[PDB]
């Protein structure tokens with residue numbers, strides 16, 4: 278039986294992660310613990326970042342120094358008003374299990390914590406302006422998770438060194454998941470005072486981002502939605518390349534499921550007014566079918582092409598992104 282501290286870590290994983298708990302807990306051998314802890318560490322970091330009761334000036338050191346707290350066995354944070362605060366109040370349990378991991382895993386995890394902290398700190402006194410800056414934000418909060426996971430898979434030796442070495446491909450995997458979430462969660466974020474859509478894009482349509490929540494502005498909102506989805510789709514060639522290299526079945530499933538869930542969510546969101554009224558989600562019955570079929574590369578490719586064709590045939594004649602949307606979809610189909 279596992280140590281009591283590790284049991285506690287898996288308890289926190291199941292409490293806090295809806296999307297990832299199952300796939301993580303199905304990982305083979307040494308990957309399971311490495312990735313459970315990687316998750317919890319980053320989830321604590323995020324809980325700090327998310328917390329708007331922590332002033333910027335106080336938040337900046339906490340984010341910068343977070344990587345170092347992993348080696349301070351009594352470090353915890355008692356001022357969080359976030360839902361996942363337990364992760365911060367009992368951080369010593371998480372950091373004890375982290376220090377129990379092989380050095381080769383510790384190094385990757387701490388390195389990712391350090392870099393994500395710097396990047397999170399950088400976006401505390403600005404929003405996202407350009408599409409380039411959108412890519413940068415997404416790299417800090419998601420791309421680096423992909424790079425982190427990739428390097429862990431390689432360190433365990435269940436996967437070839439190439440998986441951990443190709444940082445662009447791993448970065449794209451994270452970007453695709455993150456843009457999908459940001460696109461889909463427009464309203465939830467607007468209601469909580471958060472703004473993640475790029476300013477240089479939305480500003481061509483409305484004067485304030487929240488203006489897309491107003492019913493009179495729906496035609497413009499959906500145009501902006503379509504332009505941002507088109508942006509996200511450009512990461513799919515790299516997604517296909519990344520998944521095409523994976524050898525371990527448990528690692529294949531962990532990587533592929535969230536990607537095909539995000540592909541399904543993007544297609545559900547395309548040209549969809551409902552994004553501006555509430556949370557658009559793929560039906561649970563369909564989610565089950567995707568989890569079952571996405572176990573090999575050719576079946577993943579089929580799912581991708583299927584959802585691309587769904588989008589393609591829903592492009593409105595007058596959509597200002599239409600030519601771009603067709604172009605990227607073709608690229609995906611022919612690769």
Ligand SMILES: CC(C)=CCC/C(C)=C/CC/C(C)=C/[C@@H]1[C@@H](COP(=O)(O)OP(=O)(O)O)[C@]1(C)CC/C=C(\C)CCC=C(C)C
Nearest residue numbers: 294295296297315316319419422423447450451454531532
């Ligand atoms: C092992 C496995 C699939 C995942 C474990 C992921 C770990 C360590 C996360 C710790 C930090 C977190 C929480 C980040 C945020 C995820 C929120 O989505 P959500 O749906 O709200 O999930 P949940 O229900 O938990 O809230 C996010 C946007 C990052 C997405 C980018 C990834 C995952 C890299 C993909 C790239 C490759 C796989 C190359």
Ligand SMILES: [Mg+2]
Nearest residue numbers: 323324326327
């Ligand atoms: Mg968060």
Ligand SMILES: [Mg+2]
Nearest residue numbers: 323324326327
């Ligand atoms: Mg956050």
